Design a protein around this ligand. Sequence first.
Ligand SMILES: [Mg+2]
Ligand SMILES: [Mg+2]
Ligand SMILES: [Mg+2]
Ligand SMILES: [Mg+2]
Ligand SMILES: [Mg+2]
Ligand SMILES: [Mg+2]
Lengths: 63, 64
Amino acid sequence: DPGREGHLEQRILQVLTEAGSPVKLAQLVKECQAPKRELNQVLYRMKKELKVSLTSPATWCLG
Amino acid sequence: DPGREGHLEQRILQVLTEAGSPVKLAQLVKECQAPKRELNQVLYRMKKELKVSLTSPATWCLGG
DNA sequence: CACGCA
RNA sequence: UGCGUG
Ligand SMILES: [Mg+2]
Ligand SMILES: [Mg+2]
Ligand SMILES: [Mg+2]
Ligand SMILES: [Mg+2]
Ligand SMILES: [Mg+2]
Ligand SMILES: [Mg+2]
């Protein structure tokens, strides 16, 4: 669902931008009110686009 | 489902015993005619039980 | 692409 | 428990 996926990417970027430091998936699932698998589908697509990076397992930062 | 799981463990053991060597999961899925996920739930339980060993990624041998 | 994960 | 896997 692209409209949902767009909202998810929006929020991920907002939260990573406001954090200025690595953020765990556990926080992201709470911030996006979304199942972990749906967030991870978006995160790893953004990872291939070089928008976010994995600093450590299930921990994300702004690319 | 314990009846299904029992038969699946039976078939896994038959395949690994007859091979005399490590068997890939892809083989086991064809031999058992079961989805990969349900084979893996049984295989990793049998590994904890020391009935089979994981000799390399997704490759299985009889015995602990 | 290994993945079994409840 | 990292899991995204189509
Ligand atoms: Mg909107
Ligand atoms: Mg029977
Ligand atoms: Mg790998
Ligand atoms: Mg379990
Ligand atoms: Mg691990
Ligand atoms: Mg893909």
